């Protein structure tokens, strides 16, 4: 009797209760909550039809199987494997086959990225199908059964059927019952003939002993099978082991054309940079032929060491205080950020590795026209200038702070600067410093002189602040016209065309020859051409790939916020023209459109249209003259700026209430104080704020560093989200647990980064320095500081009314004392009497006994 047979007997003895717990015991699975809800509501993009997609992902990213050419998916079912293979590089065609009908899953039509090459066919029994020419053979067919003898026959029948399909090509077939003796005989027979290796997938549940025969690998079958049996028999002991949860795969959307997909880069610009990297790492420099890069130019690779973590460090301070939110899924999801080399490749493929189609000649014309009009308007007063070393140093001080004191660092800059003056680049490489200074030296004037301030840009909101954004949107709502629209763009930086960059290049026309020659270098050598390093796992280890592309946008740049704000202002303007009827479908296709009607529209109506918008980076809020703006989608899509989570040809939905308008990941409320005065406060789903608070940027932070981080978020809540009952209570709880004298430190210098009394700060922010507050009468206590409506608060994710929150908020005194005990004998202060409940529980309970 084999080892596998002993496992089956134990599996059958388990009750239905014991079976369900052991099934997902210690395994790995993906969060299908958002996916299943989406498919239920009829969402056709970004989603995977089943868990098979991520199940097949585990093999590909480890190079166990590399799907090439025609891909045949025997037993596609829902089509989990097919839609995933569609988004792969070396795949040219995907064909699916499933029996379907009653009792069997039917193929689910999707519009994910690469759907156009996917061909799913129902009513196909693979056992009666003659083999076809394919460079990749996939099979996930196998039905489990309590009797191992039954699984034995079902496994062998599949093996005999998938055999003629394998002709020195990539493959990945599912083996239902690998532990049966007669099955192994066939496996060993097929191993000597087609090679490969049998591998167990961690995403497979413990209820099945299924293993997958991959093409790329080697090893002993008999040993590997028994190791799986020993594992499943070992997991019988420990059952309550929580399954490792991972993020599901984003299959994106849109059609895929393999012919016009690859990248044709320029070399004489970036070649010097590549050469220096190659010579530095000439020890292990090589060219990986199986690179997954599609729309990016692959140059080479070299061996490195692993960098990054699968999970993020949890701020223990706030976690001990936000106990009721330990059961909330949304809060947990925000700490599941994967930064491992495996994750870097997963993130790259799903969002970074895409190509935006070249805009129509007519559209390219209007974009150029509006750009020159916009730059001339932005520079009506301010003149472009060169930033200084003194400015750079001052902002750095307010390691990295030690690198500026090193004189050798500044001389390296000069050597790189003179190259830029010669139209050459050598050391400017982006990662997933000296280059950043050179950009600041040229384009830093946009932020320092505040080019995108509302006083100068009419639409921009740079330097205003979060607490003033709400008042801005309220003023916009007063402007007559249609509803307020606010569409978010899916991956803005990945949708910047080459035409968009050339329009941003026109700013150099207002610069001095010595400034212009340096600025054009930054645009041409660092923006319109760039080299990025990115980690990638290989069967030999971790390597660093060198890629390049001549468009899109670098996330970590100096002019990231600026240029995105500029182009977005341009993008929304064109859409209004389409809405008003200025630009027609013919005009966008016409390479020679009359600029008379466009210029006249900009010279006359152009100013007011800018006053109807509030734009910050990719986020934008537009209140057009009418609701024709909603159906204006021809130009917005042709520019490559496709909206997120919505069909490309579906009219946008606007709001006539400014309180429901989303902007900068926030909505705003207008509440009424006890004195009758009105305030406009920022707001967002409560699970997000707590989710951000329970994470800690970086790892290996001491208790003090985590406590100082906690106090920062705490005072942030007390200043911005005071209107929330749960957050204000948590804020005072943290401040009570965190030592008073300890200075809050984190990656900021906002208005909550001080040691002053927050009450006095609140009066300075919302009363003193508030231009929308005519009555400067100060507020003497937090009890006069208004909350949201209980109905309003609960809808925003509050937990008020629940037993868990009720138990917490009243037993908060214990958790605070617990934190204080861990810190030690230091000086604290009770922030709980700041609110009414504990103040009445101190004037009563205190005076009684
Ligand atoms: N004889 C047969 N011929 C073709 N398909 C069959 C078959 N017997 C079963 N199937 C199909 O095989 C599929 C196995 S489940 C497929 C899951 C797939 N990998 C995904 O990720 O969606 C079932 O959907 C079943 O309908
Ligand atoms: Zn350079
Ligand atoms: Zn709200």
Question: How would DSSP label each residue in 59-92?
Answer: HHTTTS----EEEEEET-TTTHHHHHHHT-SSEE
CA proximity to 549, closest of 839, 194, 299: 299
98 lines ligand 1 (CB under 6 A): yes
Domain ranges in the chain are 1-258, 259-306+399-450+497-550, 451-496+551-651, 652-849
Minimum-distance ligand to the CA of 412?
A: 2
Residue 680 CA: which ligand is closest?
3
Q: 371: which 2 tokens? A: 């750009």
User: Is 420 within any annotated ligand binding site?
Assistant: yes
Residues contacting 378, CB < 8 A, separation 6+? 451, 456, 457, 566
The response to whether residue 75 sits with its C-beta less than 6 Å from ligand 1 reads yes
Rounded CA gap, 809 and 321, in Å? Answer: 10
Dist. CA 508–CA 310, nearest whole Å? 43
Preceding-residue numbers of gaps in the chain (C–N over 2.5 Å): 398, 432
Q: Which two tokens stand for residue 189?
A: 């027979």
Q: Where are the alpha helices (DSSP H) in 89-237?
A: 148-162, 181-194, 221-234
639 CA → ligand 2 middle, Å: 30
Torsion angle defined by CA atoms of residues 589, 593, 595 and 601, in that order, rounded to the nearest 10 degrees: -50
Cα separation, 621 vs 472, in Å, equals: 11
Query: Which residues lie closer than 8 Å to 659 by C-beta, 6 or more apart?
Result: 667, 668, 669, 670
Q: Which residue has the CA at smallest separation from atom 23 of ligand 1?
A: 77
Joined together, the tokens standing for residue 616 give 């910050």
126 CB near ligand 1 (under 6 Å)? yes
| CA 638/CA 629 separation, integer angstroms | 16
The DSSP code for 489 is: B
* Ligand 1: centre distance to CA 343 (Å): 29
Q: 3-class SS at 581?
A: coil
Q: What is the spatial order of strands in the sheet that 530-538 belongs to?
A: 297-304, 541-549, 530-538, 430-431
CA of 609 to the centre of ligand 3 (A): 28
Does the annotation flag 664 for ligand binding? no
Q: Is 270 annotated as ligand-binding?
A: no
Comparing CA positions, the residue from 98, 104, 154, 160 lying closest to residue 125 is: 98
Does the C-beta of 568 come closer than 6 Å to ligand 1? no
Task: Give me the residues paired with residue 538 across strands.
Answer: 541
Mutate to test the pocket of ligand 1, among 71, 73, 105, 205 (most ligand atoms within 8 A of CB): 105
Instruction: Tell me if 582 sits within 8 A of 595, measured CB to CB.
Output: no
212 lines ligand 1 (CB under 6 A): no
136-139 vs 678-683, strand pairing mode: unpaired
* Ligand 3 centroid, distance to 682 Cα (angstroms): 8
Q: Kindly list the distances between the CA atom of residue 318 and the CA atoms of 325, 694, 721, 796, 819, in Å, as whole numbers in the listed order.
A: 10, 6, 16, 20, 10
* Gap from CA of 103 to ligand 1 centroid (Å): 11
Task: Give the residue whose CA is nearest to atom 15 of ligand 1.
Answer: 77
Ligand at minimal distance from the CA of 791 is: 3
Does any ligand 1 atom lie closer than 6 A to the CB of residue 105?
Answer: yes
The set of catalytic residues is: 55, 140, 174, 210
Q: Is 683 annotated as a binding residue?
A: yes
Is there an atom of ligand 1 within 6 Å of 81 CB?
yes
**Residue nearest atom 11 in ligand 1 by C-alpha distance:** 75
DSSP label of 130: P
Retrieve residue 248's tokens.
């599901």
Torsion angle of the four alpha carbons 221, 227, 229, 234, in this order, in degrees rounded to the nearest 10: 180
Q: How far apart are CA 148 and CA 523, in angstroms?
A: 66
What's the 552 CA to ligand 2 centre distance in angstroms? 19
From which experimental method does this structure derive? Answer: X-ray
Determine if ligand 1 sits within 6 Å of the CB of residue 151: no
Are 208 and 246 within 8 A, CB to CB? Answer: no
Measured CA to CA in angstroms, residue 763 lies from 624, 758, 814 at distances of: 36, 9, 31
- Cβ–ligand 1 distance for 292 under 6 Å, the answer no
Protein residue with its CA nearest to atom 26 in ligand 1: 104
Given a contact cutoff of 8 angstroms between Cβ atoms, the answer to whether 265 and 550 are in contact is yes
Sign for the pseudo-dihedral over CA of 721, 725, 730, 735: positive
Give all strands (DSSP E) within 778-843, no chain letters. Answer: none
**Cβ(57) – ligand 1 distance below 6 Å:** no
Judge whether 208 and 34 are in contact, CB under 8 Å: no
Q: In angstroms, what is the span from residue 505 Cα to ligand 2's centroid?
A: 17
Record the tokens describing residue 790, joined without a space.
Answer: 């209980």
Q: At what angle do helices 221-234 and 181-194 cross, to 10 degrees?
A: 130
Q: Whose CA is nearest to atom 12 of ligand 1?
A: 75
| Residue 210 CB coordination number (10 Å) | 20
CB of 620 closer than 6 angstroms to any ligand 1 atom: no
C-beta separation of 752 from 716 below 8 A: yes
Residue 212 is assigned to a ligand binding site: yes
- Nearest residue to 105 (alpha-carbon basis) of 25, 165, 51, 30: 51
Instruction: Report resolution (Å) to 1 decimal.
Output: 3.6
Q: Which among 381, 370, 447, 360 has a CA at the least distance from the CA of 609? A: 370
Are 12 and 146 a contacting pair, CB within 8 Å? yes
The CA-CA-CA angle for residues 614, 616, 622, to 5°, reads: 30
* 640 vs 500: CA distance, rounded Å: 10
Q: Is 141 marked as binding a ligand?
A: yes
592 is annotated as contributing to ligand binding: no
724 contacts 685 by C-beta, under 8 angstroms: no
Q: Which ligand is nearest to the CA of 212?
A: 1
Residue to probe by mutation, ligand 1, list 29, 32, 104, most atoms within 8 Å of CB: 104
Alpha helices in 14-147 (DSSP H): 16-23, 33-41, 52-60, 80-86
Instruction: Decide: 73 in ligand 1 pocket, CB within 6 A.
Output: no
CA of 135 to the centre of ligand 1 (A): 21
Q: 1-258, which class in CATH?
A: alpha beta
Give the Å distance between the CA of 103 and the centre of ligand 2: 62
DSSP β-bridge partners for residue 614: 621
The torsion of the CA quartet 467, 471, 473, 474, rounded to 10 degrees, works out to 150
> Would you say 425 is a known binding-site residue?
yes
CA 98 to ligand 1: nearest atom: 5
CA atoms within 13 A on the CB side of 161: 21
453 is in an annotated binding site: no
CA angle 443, 448, 452 (to 5 degrees): 85
């Amino acid at each position: 009797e084999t080892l596998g047979e002993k496992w089956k007997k134990k599996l059958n003895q388990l009750s239905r209760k014991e079976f369900d717990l052991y099934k997902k015991s210690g395994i790995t699975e993906v969060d299908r909550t958002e996916a299943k809800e989406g498919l239920k509501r009829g969402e056709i993009t970004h989603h995977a039809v089943s868990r098979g997609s991520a199940k097949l992902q585990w093999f590909v990213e480890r190079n166990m199987v590399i799907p090439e050419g025609r891909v045949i998916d025997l037993g596609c079912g829902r089509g989990g494997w097919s839609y995933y293979c569609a988004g792969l590089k070396k795949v040219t065609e995907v064909r699916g086959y499933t029996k379907g009908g009653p009792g069997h899953e039917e193929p689910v039509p999707m519009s994910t990225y690469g759907w156009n090459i996917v061909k799913l066919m129902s009513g196909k029994d693979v056992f009666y199908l003659p083999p076809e020419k394919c460079d990749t053979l996939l099979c996930d067919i196998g039905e489990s059964s309590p009797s191992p003898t039954v699984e034995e026959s079902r496994t062998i029948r599949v093996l005999k059927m998938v055999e003629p399909w394998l002709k020195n090509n990539q493959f990945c077939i599912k083996v239902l019952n690998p532990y049966m003796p007669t099955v192994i005989e066939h496996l060993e027979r097929l191993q000597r003939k087609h090679g490969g290796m049998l591998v167990r997938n961690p995403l497979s549940r413990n209820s099945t002993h299924e293993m997958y025969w991959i093409s790329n690998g080697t090893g002993n079958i008999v040993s590997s099978v028994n190791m799986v049996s020993r594992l499943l028999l070992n997991r019988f002991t420990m059952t309550h082991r929580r399954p490792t949860i991972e993020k599901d795969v984003d299959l994106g959307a849109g059609t895929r054309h393999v012919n016009a997909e690859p990248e044709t880069p320029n070399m004489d610009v970036i070649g010097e940079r590549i050469k220096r990297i190659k010579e530095e790492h000439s020890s292990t420099w090589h060219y990986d032929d199986e690179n997954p890069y599609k729309t990016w130019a692959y140059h080479g690779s070299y061996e490195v060491k692993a960098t990054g973590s699968a999970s993020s460090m949890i701020n223990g301070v706030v976690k001990l205080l936000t106990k009721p939110w330990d059961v909330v899924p949304m809060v947990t999801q925000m700490a599941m950020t994967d930064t491992t080399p495996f994750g870097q490749q997963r993130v790259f493929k799903e969002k970074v590795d895409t190509r935006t189609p070249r805009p129509m000649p007519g559209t390219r014309k209007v974009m150029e026209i509006t750009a020159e009009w916009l730059w001339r308007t932005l520079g009506r007063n301010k003149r472009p200038r060169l930033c200084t070393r003194e400015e750079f140093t001052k902002k750095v001080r307010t390691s990295a702070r030690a690198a500026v004191e090193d004189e050798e660092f500044w001389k390296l800059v000069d050597r790189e600067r003179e190259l830029h003056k010669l139209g050459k680049c050598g050391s400017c490489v982006y990662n997933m410093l000296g280059a950043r200074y050179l950009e600041f030296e040229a384009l830093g004037f946009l932020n320092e002189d505040h080019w995108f301030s509302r006083e100068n840009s009419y639409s921009g909101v740079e330097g205003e602040g979060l607490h003033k954004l709400g008042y801005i949107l309220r003023d916009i709502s007063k402007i007559p016209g249609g509803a307020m629209y606010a569409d978010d763009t899916a991956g803005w930086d990945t949708r910047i065309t080459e035409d968009d960059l050339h329009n941003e290049e026109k700013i150099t026309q207002q610069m001095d020859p010595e400034h212009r020659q340096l600025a054009n270098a930054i645009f041409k050598l660092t923006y319109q051409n760039k080299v990025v390093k990115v980690q990638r796992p290989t069967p030999k280890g971790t390597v660093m790939d060198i890629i390049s592309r001549k468009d899109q946008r670098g996330s970590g740049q100096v002019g990231t916020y600026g240029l995105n704000t500029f182009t977005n202002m341009e993008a929304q303007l064109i859409r209004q023209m389409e809405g008003e009827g200025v630009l027609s479908k013919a005009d966008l296709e016409n390479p020679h459109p009359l600029e008379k009607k466009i210029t006249q529209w900009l010279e006359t109506k152009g100013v007011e249209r800018l006053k109807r918008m509030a734009i910050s980076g990719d986020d934008c809020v537009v209140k057009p003259i009418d609701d024709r703006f909603a159906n204006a989608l021809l130009a917005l899509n042709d520019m490559g700026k496709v909206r997120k989570d919505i069909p490309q040809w579906q009219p946008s939905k606007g709001w006539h209430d400014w309180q429901q308008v989303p902007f900068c990941s926030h909505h705003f409320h207008e509440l009424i104080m006890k004195d009758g005065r009105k305030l406009v406060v920022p707001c967002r789903p409560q699970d997000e704020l707590i989710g951000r608070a329970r994470i800690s940027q970086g790892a290996g932070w001491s208790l003090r560093e985590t406590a100082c981080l906690g106090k920062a978020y705490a005072q942030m809540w007390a200043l911005m989200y005071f209107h929330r009952r749960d957050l204000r209570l948590a804020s005072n709880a943290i401040c009570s647990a965190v030592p008073v004298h300890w200075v809050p430190t984190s990656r900021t210098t906002h208005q909550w980064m001080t040691t002053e009394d927050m009450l006095t700060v609140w009066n300075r922010v919302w009363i003193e320095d508030n231009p929308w507050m005519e009555d400067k009468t100060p507020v003497t206590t937090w009890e006069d500081v208004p909350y949201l409506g209980k109905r309003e608060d609960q809808w925003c994710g509050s937990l008020i009314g629940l037993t868990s929150r009720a138990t917490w908020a009243q037993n908060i005194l214990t958790a605070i004392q617990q934190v204080r005990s861990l810190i030690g004998n230091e000086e604290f202060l009770d922030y709980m009497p700041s609110m009414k409940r504990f103040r009445k529980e101190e004037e009563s309970e205190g005076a009684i006994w």
